[PDB]
Design a protein around this nucleic acid. Structure first.
Ligand SMILES: [Mg+2]
Ligand SMILES: [Mg+2]
Ligand SMILES: [Mg+2]
Ligand SMILES: [Mg+2]
Ligand SMILES: [Mg+2]
Ligand SMILES: [Mg+2]
Ligand SMILES: [Mg+2]
Ligand SMILES: [Mg+2]
Ligand SMILES: [Mg+2]
Ligand SMILES: [Mg+2]
Ligand SMILES: [Mg+2]
Ligand SMILES: [Mg+2]
Length: 156
RNA sequence: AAAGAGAGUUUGAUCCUGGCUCAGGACGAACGCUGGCGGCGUGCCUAAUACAUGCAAGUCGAACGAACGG
């Protein structure tokens, strides 16, 4: 059982001879607070039907976020097109400090204390892409030692 | 140890670039409506413009020649 959060609902149009036909596009972030999160996109003639398509789509982009002490292991920078996101660990109890669409991908992912800053564009779809582009770079300390052949206490 | 929030606006609809505007904090402040108290501070930013009237620099008879008091 996952949680839903509608980010943006936008009305788009294509021009056809007689006039204009309008459609609704919805962007939805889905995940459980344990560390899994994903996003999707839908399109329909009605707002309720656009969400349902986006929920099913979002269940195909699930990603895992590694966290230590309810905080990301280190500092990463996302990048996707014209949008980029800076994610930074923060002290316990500070809470999430994030912009509009980047809060959803962090509160749903279960991260409790993290600081961020959007250095790029403002488009909601490119902020979600640029954020997940940062979670990919995120590594745990346990796995780093495994690649480097060291042990955890030797690293730190 | 500390550690950074965005939004509106070009288009039939979109993505970028890009300016304009807004949400926060601070004044030796002024103006508008209203107005109980106590503590601690502050009060000519302009004409270094012109100034009534009072007071802000005196003291020593144990350094040297006086007036009340027989
Ligand atoms: Mg228009
Ligand atoms: Mg701008
Ligand atoms: Mg501030
Ligand atoms: Mg304000
Ligand atoms: Mg009164
Ligand atoms: Mg009054
Ligand atoms: Mg003066
Ligand atoms: Mg003069
Ligand atoms: Mg005089
Ligand atoms: Mg006097
Ligand atoms: Mg004498
Ligand atoms: Mg003497």
């Amino acid at each position: 059982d996952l949680e839903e959060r509608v980010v943006t609902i936008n009305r788009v149009a294509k021009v056809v001879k007689g006039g204009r036909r309008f459609r609704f596009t919805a962007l939805v972030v889905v995940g459980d607070k344990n560390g899994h999160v994903g996003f999707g996109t839908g399109k329909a003639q009605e707002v309720p039907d656009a969400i349902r398509k986006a929920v099913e789509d979002a269940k195909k982009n699930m990603v895992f976020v590694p966290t230590v002490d309810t905080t990301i292991p280190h500092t990463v920078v996302g990048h996707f097109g014209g949008g980029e996101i800076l994610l930074k660990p923060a002290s316990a109890g500070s809470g999430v400090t994030a912009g509009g669409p980047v809060r959803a991908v962090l509160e749903l992912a279960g991260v409790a204390d993290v600081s961020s800053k959007s250095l790029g564009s403002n488009t909601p779809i490119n902020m979600v892409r640029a954020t997940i582009d940062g979670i990919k770079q995120l590594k745990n300390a346990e796995d780093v030692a495994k690649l480097r052949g060291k042990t955890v206490e030797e690293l730190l």
